[PDB]
Structure formats: structure tokens, C-alpha cells
Amino acid sequence: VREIVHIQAGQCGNQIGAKFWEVISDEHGIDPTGSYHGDSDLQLERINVYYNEATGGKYVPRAILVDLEPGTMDSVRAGQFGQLFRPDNFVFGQSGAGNNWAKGYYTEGQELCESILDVIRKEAESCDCLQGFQLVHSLGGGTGAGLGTLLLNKLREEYPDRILSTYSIVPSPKVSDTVVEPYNCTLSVHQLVESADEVFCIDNEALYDICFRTLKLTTPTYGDLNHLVSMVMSGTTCALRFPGQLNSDLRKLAVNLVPFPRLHFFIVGFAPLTSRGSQQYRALTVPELTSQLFDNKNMMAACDPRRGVYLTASAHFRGRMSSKEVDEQMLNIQARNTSYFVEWIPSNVKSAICDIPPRGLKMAATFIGNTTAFRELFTRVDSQFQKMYARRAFIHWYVNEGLETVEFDEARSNMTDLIQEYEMYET
Amino acid sequence: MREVISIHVGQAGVQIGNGCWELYCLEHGIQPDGQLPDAFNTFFSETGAGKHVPRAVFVDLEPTVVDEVRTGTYRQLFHPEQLISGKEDAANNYARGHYTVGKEIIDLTLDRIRKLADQCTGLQGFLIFHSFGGGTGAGFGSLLLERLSVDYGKKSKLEFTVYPSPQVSTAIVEPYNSILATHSMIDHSDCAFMVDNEALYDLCRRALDIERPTYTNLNRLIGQVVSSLTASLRFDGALNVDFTEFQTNLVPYARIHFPICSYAPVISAEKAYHEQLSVAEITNSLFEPANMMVKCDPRHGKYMACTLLYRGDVVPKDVSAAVATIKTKRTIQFVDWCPTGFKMGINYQPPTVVPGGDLAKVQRAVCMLANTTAIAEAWSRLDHKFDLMYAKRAFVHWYVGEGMEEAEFPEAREDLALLEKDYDEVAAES
Amino acid sequence: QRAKSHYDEREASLKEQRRRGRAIIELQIEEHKINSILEAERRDREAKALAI
Amino acid sequence: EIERAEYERIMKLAEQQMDEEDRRNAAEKKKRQERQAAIDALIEKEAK
Numbered sequence: 033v034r035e036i037v038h039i040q041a042g043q044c045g046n047q048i049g050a051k052f053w054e055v056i057s058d059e060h061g062i063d064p065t066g067s068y069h070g071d072s073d074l075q076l077e078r079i080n081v082y083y084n085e086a087t088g089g090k091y092v093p094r095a096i097l098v099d100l101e102p103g104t105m106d107s108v109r110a111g112q113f114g115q116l117f118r119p120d121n122f123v124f125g126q127s128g129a130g131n132n133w134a135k136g137y138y139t140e141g142q143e144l145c146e147s148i149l150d151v152i153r154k155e156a157e158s159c160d161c162l163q164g165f166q167l168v169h170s171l172g173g174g175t176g177a178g179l180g181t182l183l184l185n186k187l188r189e190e191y192p193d194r195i196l197s198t199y200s201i202v203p204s205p206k207v208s209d210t211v212v213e214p215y216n217c218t219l220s221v222h223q224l225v226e227s228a229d230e231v232f233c234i235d236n237e238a239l240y241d242i243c244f245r246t247l248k249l250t251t252p253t254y255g256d257l258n259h260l261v262s263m264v265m266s267g268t269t270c271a272l273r274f275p276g277q278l279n280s281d282l283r284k285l286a287v288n289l290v291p292f293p294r295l296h297f298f299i300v301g302f303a304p305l306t307s308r309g310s311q312q313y314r315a316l317t318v319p320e321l322t323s324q325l326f327d328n329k330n331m332m333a334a335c336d337p338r339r340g341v342y343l344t345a346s347a348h349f350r351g352r353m354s355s356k357e358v359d360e361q362m363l364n365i366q367a368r369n370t371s372y373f374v375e376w377i378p379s380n381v382k383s384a385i386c387d388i389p390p391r392g393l394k395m396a397a398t399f400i401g402n403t404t405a406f407r408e409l410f411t412r413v414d415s416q417f418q419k420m421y422a423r424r425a426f427i428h429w430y431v432n433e434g435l436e437t438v439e440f441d442e443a444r445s446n447m448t449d450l451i452q453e454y455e456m457y458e459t
Numbered sequence: 460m461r462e463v464i465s466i467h468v469g470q471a472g473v474q475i476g477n478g479c480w481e482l483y484c485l486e487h488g489i490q491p492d493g494q495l496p497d498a499f500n501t502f503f504s505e506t507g508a509g510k511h512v513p514r515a516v517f518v519d520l521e522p523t524v525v526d527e528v529r530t531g532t533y534r535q536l537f538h539p540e541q542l543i544s545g546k547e548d549a550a551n552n553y554a555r556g557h558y559t560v561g562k563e564i565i566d567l568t569l570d571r572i573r574k575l576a577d578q579c580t581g582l583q584g585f586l587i588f589h590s591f592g593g594g595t596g597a598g599f600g601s602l603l604l605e606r607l608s609v610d611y612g613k614k615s616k617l618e619f620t621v622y623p624s625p626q627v628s629t630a631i632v633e634p635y636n637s638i639l640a641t642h643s644m645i646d647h648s649d650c651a652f653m654v655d656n657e658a659l660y661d662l663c664r665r666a667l668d669i670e671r672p673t674y675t676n677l678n679r680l681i682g683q684v685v686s687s688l689t690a691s692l693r694f695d696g697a698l699n700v701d702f703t704e705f706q707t708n709l710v711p712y713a714r715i716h717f718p719i720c721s722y723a724p725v726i727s728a729e730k731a732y733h734e735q736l737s738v739a740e741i742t743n744s745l746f747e748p749a750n751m752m753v754k755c756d757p758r759h760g761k762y763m764a765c766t767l768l769y770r771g772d773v774v775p776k777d778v779s780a781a782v783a784t785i786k787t788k789r790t791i792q793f794v795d796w797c798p799t800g801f802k803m804g805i806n807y808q809p810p811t812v813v814p815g816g817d818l819a820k821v822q823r824a825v826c827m828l829a830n831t832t833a834i835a836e837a838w839s840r841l842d843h844k845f846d847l848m849y850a851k852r853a854f855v856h857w858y859v860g861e862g863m864e865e866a867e868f869p870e871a872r873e874d875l876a877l878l879e880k881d882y883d884e885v886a887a888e889s
Numbered sequence: 890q891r892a893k894s895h896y897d898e899r900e901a902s903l904k905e906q907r908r909r910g911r912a913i914i915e916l917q918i919e920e921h922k923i924n925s926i927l928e929a930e931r932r933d934r935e936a937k938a939l940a941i
Numbered sequence: 942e943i944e945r946a947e948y949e950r951i952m953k954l955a956e957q958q959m960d961e962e963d964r965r966n967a968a969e970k971k972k973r974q975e976r977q978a979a980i981d982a983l984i985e986k987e988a989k
């Protein structure tokens with residue numbers, strides 16, 4: 033009884049979350065209409081963690097979808113699992129997103145939040161227990177950034193004990209979709225540092241690189257990218273739904289991986305990924321998974337770990353394997369590459385083994401890592417934000433909404449302080 | 460549900476509008492009678508049985524062009540109250556259209572526009588067309604925009620106007636009207652797109668084998684650009700782009716709003732079979748000055764903001780590859796303080812063609828909108844021409860006698876000068 | 890619940906009849922008005938021919 | 942493991958089958974309606 037509430041915002045968040053619900057529904061074996069036609073009894077043991085039961089043999093997910101513009105939910109309702117979500121869980125206004133963080137935070141954010149908090153409260157107290165909330169939002173845009181930060185602050189005000197684990201996409205440095213993206217990223221970082229406990233960030237250019245390097249996807253759409261984020265989502269919480277040889281929930285991961293209150297930003301990775309044509313050459317074993325997991329080329333974040341050092345790390349495993357083999361590999365990978373690990377924290381690698389593998393993949397593992405390579409991601413946006421801030425250009429647009437120009441300086445100062453904190457902890 | 464009001468002024472606005480509605484009715488598939496043999500609210504309004512009515516008001520002080528539509532094949536589609544025609548035109552006089560004749564009919568048009576907006580609850584902005592050199596076009600456009608500024612406040616008043624050509628001109632008093640309109644547009648207009656006749660004339664033969672096009676062929680090219688702009692608001696897409704999204708990103712400052720427009724690929728119905736027209740080809744050919752619709756070389760100026768709108772089989776992976784290759788072009792310069800400068804949006808609906816027509820069955824197309832300091836080249840020519848006119852007081856007596864005060868001419872001259880300095884200051888590096 | 894689903898169908902049919910009434914009658918009235926002009930063909934063109 | 946991979950490959954083919962219907966329908970219905978709105982609406986104006 034560790035129910036987790038799922039929240040979506042923006043076009044990017046809603047589409048990713050929609051793909052997430054497809055994967056988790058298929059994992060348990062639930063028909064698109066909400067009725068069970070699965071294959072195993074172990075699927076029903078802890079289905080309460082993500083679903084509510086509507087009397088009649090129908091399951092309604094603990095999901096809330098929010099967008100400022102109504103365009104996105106038209107595709108969601110037309111989707112395969114559109115009918116699954118509660119009709120009263122669709123909360124939205126009738127104004128354009130505007131791609132503006134200040135507009136999304138002060139103009140439409142205030143009006144929408146008063147409607148949203150009641151739906152969240154109705155979903156939160158519907159279950160006996162609630163370990164924490166789960167959020168998917170976009171930092172680059174206006175709706176997902178501003179609304180996500182405002183809702184995170186409000187949830188922290190109301191539910192201090194619960195773990196607010198969030199997933200976000202950091203704007204790509206080279207070819208991104210927004211001119212004014214550095215403004216939104218810089219403003220969102222300030223609230224995101226102080227509010228959320230567990231944070232994971234994905235770079236889209238890394239997704240294109242990973243998809244083309246490994247899976248040989250000739251025509252990579254957004255579906256496969258959203259699909260990859262789904263396995264990262266599914267492998268994160270696998271322990272709560274099913275048993276295993278070593279249990280680890282979100283609170284265990286947060287205590288183990290977070291050494292200080294301001295160092296909690298994480299990067300993620302998933303394994304195994306194999307080419308669909310040459311997948312029948314791989315005798316996948318635990319050493320092979322460890323090589324794929326710890327490889328820099330399979331990281332969903334555009335930051336090379338070799339350029340920095342690690343602080344804490346953790347690996348979650350799925351399937352039936354030996355515990356000694358995981359421990360021996362874990363010791364070997366720590367001893368061989370000591371150049372990238374701090375000397376004052378021994379045994380920086382934490383393990384967790386669930387028992388049931390996911391569909392389609394005889395055995396699987398997931399990796400979450402924390403490192404000082406985060407400075408490069410903050411370096412790119414800092415330089416871009418300084419260039420944007422030099423000639424006062426787009427300050428004009430944000431002024432008409434109510435935002436003060438000093439807020440940029442406070443946000444950049446806070447993010448620069450985080451850069452310094454990562455720098456001095458490298459020693 | 461979500462809606463755009465179209466307002467057309469003068470001869471060009473009506474003739475441009477006629478071509479556009481030809482494309483729009485075909486692209487959705489509505490018969491000329493409004494019946495059938497979606498996102499209709501974007502431009503179409505719905506009536507009782509099956510009839511559709513377009514969300515447009517056609518305004519002109521001369522009844523000749525309006526009567527053509529009343530007699531034309533599309534006469535049943537438009538509601539008779541939407542077609543307002545005046546008695547006598549402004550005679551290519553800004554003062555006559557601004558004060559004497561325009562103020563006679565101004566109140567009637569505003570009521571019609573306001574009444575239309577009630578059925579159009581999903582309003583996001585207005586689209587307005589003008590001729591800069593014309594009298595009714597520029598003269599009536601100024602009064603309409605000034606009234607709408609206080610009537611509706613914060614609403615996106617986008618515009619698409621024909622700027623005078625650098626050398627080709629069909630009006631002697633053209634510089635007077637343009638300098639007077641420019642003063643009016645720069646204050647209230649949210650974002651006004653620019654095109655000129657001369658470059659449209661050159662492309663209509665260079666890009667496709669038409670030896671002697673007419674206003675009909677030019678209007679079809681304009682309609683294609685407008686269709687792609689509103690395509691994201693009409694159909695599903697991987698990246699939805701709204702009007703406020705354009706407004707925030709395109710303009711970095713209040714007075715530097717003026718963008719430029721481009722379209723590609725424009726190719727005859729026969730040559731399309733020879734070339735692949737991949738995403739790289741359509742993206743690379745956009746930046747060429749030959750495809751520019753405004754006869755100002757981008758190499759003279761700089762790039763500060765660009766927008767790409769795609770329609771076809773576009774894959775996001777190729778977009779990133781195409782944009783990355785563009786940034787490697789040393790011939791293209793960007794202001795250092797704007798490193799990214801790109802917004803792209805993807806729509807699934809392909810372009811639609813019209814018979815007796817000029818384009819081909821292009822599988823994939825793309826629309827390009829950008830803001831450049833090369834527009835300063837165009838302004839200097841207008842300023843120089845006006846100075847030659849006002850040095851000897853060439854046509855002052857015509858404008859003064861129509862109620863306009865002479866003290867405005869130096870004021871409008873200063874406003875153009877301040878815009879010129881503003882563009883130079885922005886283009887300066889640090 | 891299904892019974893009111895057909896009840897909703899009844900409301901849809903009635904709201905369809907609302908449009909059908911205008912759809913057919915207003916077209917017919919214009920046809921009669923056109924025939925009134927056909928009467929105007931003989932009360933004017935031939936009567937003023939008698940004026941000739 | 943492989944013993945259950947024998948069933949796993951069949952189920953993956955079932956997922957591939959579902960993708961086949963979904964993508965095929967999205968393409969076949971889209972193309973012909975697109976051609977109709979462009980070309981069949983075009984033919985009327987050619988005669989006009």
C-alpha cells in the first residue's frame with residue numbers, strides 16, 4: 033500500500049505520460065477499457081499502487097492531466113488508452129500557452145492552480161497511503177515550466193512529508209525548439225532546486241544519439257523517444273509492485289543517493305538496448321548488463337561522466353540472477369575505475385533486485401547516477417542566458433506580465449551558486 | 460472554439476482575399492455554396508442547415524471590386540452585410556482617406572466587425588491586409604487600427620501588407636502614403652509581415668516557367684504562405700504553434716517587430732518529378748536571396764530571429780540535421796546575443812493546389828519567417844525618395860486641402876528617422 | 890441509463906427538426922418570392938409594353 | 942529464461958502486429974482524404 037499519484041503538464045509531459053500509461057498497463061495486463069485480462073496472479077497483488085478500482089471490474093489510474101491549451105488532450109482522448117483517465121481529471125483553461133514562463137506562472141498559473149489543487153486533493157486522499165507524488169513536465173517551454181514549478185511549490189506547502197519526485201527535459205544546447213528557452217530554464221531552476229527532492233533530467237539530443245547509435249532506428253519519431261523514457265519510468269518503481277531479493281523504494285533511493293540537501297539532481301540510464309537485427313548475437317549476462325549500464329554512450333543525459341567525478345550511484349535489477357554475481361561485478365567496477373570516484377565515500381554503488389522481469393526482455397536493469405558533470409549542462413544555459421540578457425532584448429515581453437527584472441539576477445546567482453557547490457565538492 | 464477574423468482593405472486586400480478563400484474552401488473541401496457534397500471555426504462560421512459563412516469583412520471605398528464578388532461565383536458564400544462598399548475612393552490620397560471619406564464609413568465597419576466577434580468566442584487575433592502606396596488601403600487602414608487599439612486592447616493584431624518595390628512603382632504619390640502609414644503601423648500593430656511586388660514578380664518566373672504572370676498568380680503565392688501560417692491552427696501536428704508563440708519569439712523589441720517572409724519549394728508542375736525535394740533541399744533553399752519575397756539581401760544585414768513551419772512528411776531528426784548544417788554556413792551571420800534564434804513547428808497536413816495553377820504536387824513543404832536588419836536597406840530608399848519630394852514641396856497642396864495639417868510631415872519624417880537609428884543601434888555589437 | 894441515451898437521441902432529433910424547419914421553409918419562401926418577381930415580369934414588362 | 946523467451950518472441954510479434962494495424966490505418970486513411978481535398982476539389986474549378 034504505497035500508492036503513487038501521477039501528474040502531467042504541457043504537451044511534452046502529456047505525450048510522455050500517455051506513453052507511460054501504455055507501458056504500465058501492458059505490464060500489469062489491463063485492456064484499454066480498464067478490465068483485466070492478464071496472465072499471472074502476481075499482477076494483481078499490488079495493482080492498487082497506481083490504480084483505483086471502479087466497482088464493476090474497471091480500473092481508473094491515479095493520473096491528472098493539465099494543459100493551458102486544449103489542443104493536446106484531443107490527441108490524448110483519441111489515443112489507445114484515452115478512455116482510461118477520469119473525465120473530471122481533465123483540468124484546462126481556454127488560453128494559449130504563449131511559450132512564456134512568466135505568463136504561465138502569473139497570468140494563467142494562478143487561475144488554473146485553484147482548480148487543480150482540488151482534483152489533486154481528491155486523488156490524494158482517495159487511497160489509504162501515499163508515499164509521494166510523481167510529476168512529468170518540460171523546462172524548455174512555458175506551460176510545463178511555470179505551471180510545474182508553481183504546482184511543486186504548492187504541493188510542498190501542503191505535503192512536506194511526501195517525496196516529490198519529478199521528471200523533466202532540459203533544453204538541448206545545439207538545436208532546440210525555442211528561441212527564449214534559456215530564460216525559462218534559468219527561472220525554473222531556482223524553484224526546482226529548493227522544492228523537489230528527487231530530480232531526473234533528459235536531453236533530447238542524447239535521445240537521438242542513443243536511438244540512432246544502438247537501435248538503428250531509421251525514422252526516429254517522438255514515440256520511440258517517449259517509449260525509452262517509459263522503461264526508465266517503469267524500472268524506477270518496479271520494487272513497489274513486485275517482490276525480489278532486495279527491496280528498495282523511493283525513500284531508500286533518496287537517502288542513499290543524496291549526500292547534501294542541494295545535491296540531488298540525477299541522471300538516468302537503461303539497459304539492455306540491442307540492435308533489432310543483431311540482437312541474436314548477444315549472450316546477455318550480468319557482466320554484459322553492467323558494461324552496458326556503466327557505459328557513457330548509453331546515458332540519457334548529454335554529459336560525459338569521465339569529464340567529472342561520481343558521488344553516489346545505484347543500480348536496480350529485474351529478473352532471476354545471483355546476488356553474488358551482482359556484488360562481485362559491483363566491487364569490480366568500483367575498483368577498476370577509481371579515478372572517477374571520491375575517496376571519502378567508499379561503496380558508492382547501491383543495489384536492488386526485483387524478481388519479475390518486464391515483458392519482452394528476459395532480464396533487465398536500470399541505472400541512476402549523480403555526478404559533478406552537471407556543471408556542463410548549467411554552463412550551456414548560463415552562457416546562453418548571459419548572451420540573451422546582455423542587450424535587454426526579451427526582457428520587454430516578460431515585463432508586461434508582472435515579472436521583475438531582478439528575478440533573472442536572483443535565479444542566475446542561485447544557479448551559479450549550485451555550480452560552485454558542485455565544484456567545491458569535487459575535492 | 461478558436462478563431463481568426465480577416466479584414467481586407469482596398470483593391471489588393473480584396474483581390475488577395477479572393478485568391479486566399481479559393482485555397483481555403485478547397486483545402487477544407489467546402490463547396491462554393493457553403494454546403495458539403497474539424498477546425499472550421501478558424502476561418503469558417505456555421506449557419507443553420509449546412510451553409511458555411513466566412514469570418515471576413517471586405518471593405519473598400521470603391522464599389523467596382525466589391526461588385527465583382529457580388530456578381531462572382533462566390534456570391535452566395537459571403538453574407539451580403541459583410542460586403543461593404545463605399546461611394547468614391549481616396550484617390551491615392553492619404554489625407555482624403557484618413558479624414559474626409561474614411562470617417563464617413565468608419566462607424567459602419569466597426570459595428571460589423573464587433574458583431575462578427577460575438578459568434579467568434581474563440582478569438583485569438585485579427586488579420587488585416589493593406590496596400591502601402593494606395594489611398595484607401597493605407598489611409599483607411601490607419602483609422603481602423605487606431606480605433607481597434609482602444610476597442611479590444613490586448614489582442615494580436617497581425618498584418619500582411621505589400622510594401623512599395625525598390626524600383627517598380629505605379630503611383631507617383633506612393634512615398635507620401637507609405638511614410639504616413641509607417642508612422643501609424645509601427646505604434647499599434649503587434650507584428651506586421653512584409654512583402655513587395657517586385658520580388659514576387661521575379662520569383663513567379665524564376666522558380667517556375669511562367670513568362671508573364673498577372674495579379675492572379677501573385678495572389679496564389681500569398682495565399683499559400685498564409686495557409687501555412689494558419690495550418691498549425693487548423694490541423695494536428697507534432698509541434699503546435701499559436702499566434703502568441705510567434706509574437707513573443709519573433710520580435711525582440713517593440714519597434715523592431717517587422718519580419719520578412721519566404722517560402723520553398725516553389726517549382727513548376729513538371730520539374731518536381733526530377734528532384735527529390737528532401738527536407739535538406741527545402742531547408743537549404745530557404746536562406747537564398749533568390750527565394751526572398753523582399754528585395755533586400757540578407758548578407759547586407761544580420762539574422763536575429765527565425766521561424767520554420769513545416770508541412771509534409773517531415774521527420775524531426777532531419778530538422779535537427781538541417782538546422783545544424785545551416786548554423787555551419789559562414790555566409791549566414793547571427794547576432795551574438797541571440798545564440799539559438801530558431802523556433803520550428805511541424806504540421807502533418809500537406810499543401811493543397813488550385814487548378815489553372817502554378818505550383819506542383821509537392822509532397823513536403825516549409826514556410827520561413829525571419830527578422831533581419833536588411834530591412835534597413837529598404838527604409839533608407841523610402842526616406843531618400845521622400846526628401847526629394849518634400850525638398851521642392853511636390854504634392855503638398857493636395858494633402859493639405861483634405862484636412863491634414865502640414866505639421867505632421869516633419870513628425871512622420873522624424874518617426875522614420877528614429878526607426879532607422881533604432882535598427883542601427885540594435886544591429887550594433889558589443 | 891441506456892433509456893436516457895435514447896432520450897438524448899430524442900433531444901437530438903428534435904434539435905435536428907429545429908434546423909430542418911428553417912432549412913426547408915426559408916428556402917421555399919425565397920422560391921415563392923422569386924415567383925413574385927415572375928409575376929413582376931407581366932405587371933411591368935408587358936404592362937409598360939402597353940404603355941408603349 | 943529462454944524457455945520463457947520462446948513465448949516472449951511470440952508476444953513481441955503480437956505487439957508488432959498491433960503497431961502494424963495502427964500505423965497502416967493512420968497512413969491509408971490520411972493519404973486518400975488528402976488527395977480528395979486537393980485534387981477532387983481542384984477538378985471542379987478546372988471546369989469552372
Ligand SMILES: Nc1nc2c(ncn2[C@@H]2O[C@H](COP(=O)(O)OP(=O)(O)OP(=O)(O)O)[C@@H](O)[C@H]2O)c(=O)[nH]1
Nearest residue numbers: 469470471474548549550551590593594595596674
Ligand atoms: N500583389 C498584388 N497587389 C495588388 C493587387 N491589387 C492591387 N494591388 C496593389 O495595390 C496598390 C494600390 O492599390 P489601389 O487600388 O490603386 O489604391 P487603394 O489602396 O485601393 O486606395 P485608393 O487610392 O483609394 O484606390 C498597387 O500598388 C498594387 O500593387 C493584387 O491583386 N496583388
Ligand SMILES: Nc1nc2c(ncn2[C@@H]2O[C@H](COP(=O)(O)OP(=O)(O)O)[C@@H](O)[C@H]2O)c(=O)[nH]1
Nearest residue numbers: 042043044047170173174175176177209254257
Ligand atoms: N521527448 C519528447 N519531447 C517533446 C514531446 N512533445 C514536445 N516535446 C519537446 O518539448 C518542448 C516543448 O515542451 P512543451 O510541452 O510545449 O512545454 P510547455 O509549453 O511549457 O508546456 C519542445 O522542445 C519539444 O521538442 C514528446 O512527445 N516527446
Ligand SMILES: [Mg+2]
Nearest residue numbers: 469470593595
Ligand atoms: Mg484602390
